Design a protein around this ligand. Structure first.
Ligand SMILES: Nc1ncnc2c1ncn2[C@@H]1O[C@H](COP(=O)(O)OP(=O)(O)O)[C@@H](O)[C@H]1O
Ligand SMILES: [Cl-]
Ligand SMILES: [Mg+2]
Ligand code: NA
Length: 364
């Protein structure tokens, strides 16, 4: 299976940190087990002895090719040092301000990265295909325009995504809104997929697989599950979107949130020209039970020692594959909440989800 160094040239250094600072630090370790030879910028608390212990159980090692930082200033100074004095190109997962690093030191064209990930611009990347009823509306005209829409509908920035089923939901959304907004019909989906692809010049476009997104009825993220039953026309919709981005210079990993309705129509509701936590579930498939897999993340309830030791219990049982660990005790005992990203895997959904619930009960 592919690793990230297969996609990125030797001069690239990778950061998955968003520009909650502790949650952002926790994300720096997200890709460590798939990075291989790619150097990764990681918070010190994301690679303590606790991470080494978890990886050791499953026969993995922490990459030696990490650069660490411990606060905002050290993060920003490290980026400048690598680009200005070590001839590195920085591959970002999230938009960073120009004061941090001028565009000429980006591994991937910043203007293209912003355009590919701009939700208002989805129709450009699908060539007008795969769209629900959807309009981009300036905020001053929004309240009057929204009266023309039937429920259920979705409001997105052009607060986060606001799914509205009725007038009460809409009035709450309007209060939170008070330059542009996306209004979209809420599709009554029978399936969703996050379909993922990689590209490099030597490899061409490669389909990596797909994960289902677990979301509540308001779209809030509750994890990702494995799936091998992706319809060919869903894969092809994703491949077309990938090719559109690649043709303008995209390289690396991308994932597309594709919904399918009861008539098998495909809707592209979110394009992520960047990777996510579930990319690791696809690329580590050789080490996971294929029966059922669920990727998610968890926070300490307070006692970081009990959090870690409960995690270690389940890792040693073999049900729980550790991906990332932010050690809040790096700041002092229980001063900051530890955080953990992982894959539950096993023979069936029933047994795996029972293990997850047992773990959550043991924590609380
Ligand atoms: N038009 C839509 N129809 C149905 N569900 C939607 C729609 N837009 C968003 N959702 C739901 O909300 C979730 C989050 O929306 P998304 O646009 O993917 O935002 P994010 O950028 O936070 O991923 C989706 O995964 C899906 O479950
Ligand atoms: Cl843009
Ligand atoms: Mg999404
Ligand atoms: Na996106």
């Amino acid at each position: 299976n592919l690793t990230l160094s297969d996609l990125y040239d030797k001069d690239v250094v990778y950061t998955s940190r968003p520009s909650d600072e502790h949650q952002s630090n926790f994300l720096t370790g997200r890709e460590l087990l798939i990075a291989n030879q790619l150097p990764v910028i990681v918070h010190e608390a994301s690679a303590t002895d606790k991470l080494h212990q978890l990886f050791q159980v499953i026969g993995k090692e922490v990459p030696n090719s990490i650069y660490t930082f411990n606060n905002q200033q050290s993060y920003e100074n490290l980026i400048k040092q690598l680009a200005h004095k070590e001839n590195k190109k920085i591959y970002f997962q999230y938009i960073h301000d120009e004061t941090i690093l001028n565009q000429q030191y980006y591994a991937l064209d910043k203007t293209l990265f912003v355009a590919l990930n701009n939700k208002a611009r989805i129709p450009e990347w699908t060539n007008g295909k795969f769209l629900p009823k959807r309009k981009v509306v300036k905020i001053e005209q929004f309240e009057n325009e929204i009266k023309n829409w039937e429920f259920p509908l979705v409001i997105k920035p052009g607060y986060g995504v606001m799914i509205c089923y009725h007038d009460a939901d809409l009035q709450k959304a309007i209060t939170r809104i008070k330059n542009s907004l996306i209004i979209e019909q809420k599709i009554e989906e029978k399936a969703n997929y996050c379909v993922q692809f990689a590209y490099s010049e030597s490899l061409g476009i490669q389909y990596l697989g797909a994960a289902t997104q677990l979301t509540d009825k308001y779209g809030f993220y509750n994890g990702n599950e494995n799936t091998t039953n992706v319809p060919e026309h869903v894969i092809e919709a994703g491949r077309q979107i990938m090719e559109n981005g690649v043709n303008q210079g995209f390289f690396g990993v991308a994932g597309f949130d594709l919904l399918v309705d009861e008539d098998d129509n495909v809707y592209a509701i979110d394009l992520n020209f960047r990777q996510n936590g579930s990319t690791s579930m696809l690329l580590l498939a050789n080490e996971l039970n294929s029966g059922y897999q669920k990727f998610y993340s968890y926070h300490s309830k307070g006692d970081n020692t009990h959090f870690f030791n409960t995690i270690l219990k389940y890792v040693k049982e073999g049900s729980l594959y550790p991906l990332s660990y932010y050690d809040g005790d790096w700041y002092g005992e229980d001063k900051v909440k530890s955080r953990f990203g992982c894959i539950w895997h096993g023979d069936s959904k029933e047994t795996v989800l029972e293990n997850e619930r047992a773990f959550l009960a043991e924590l609380e």
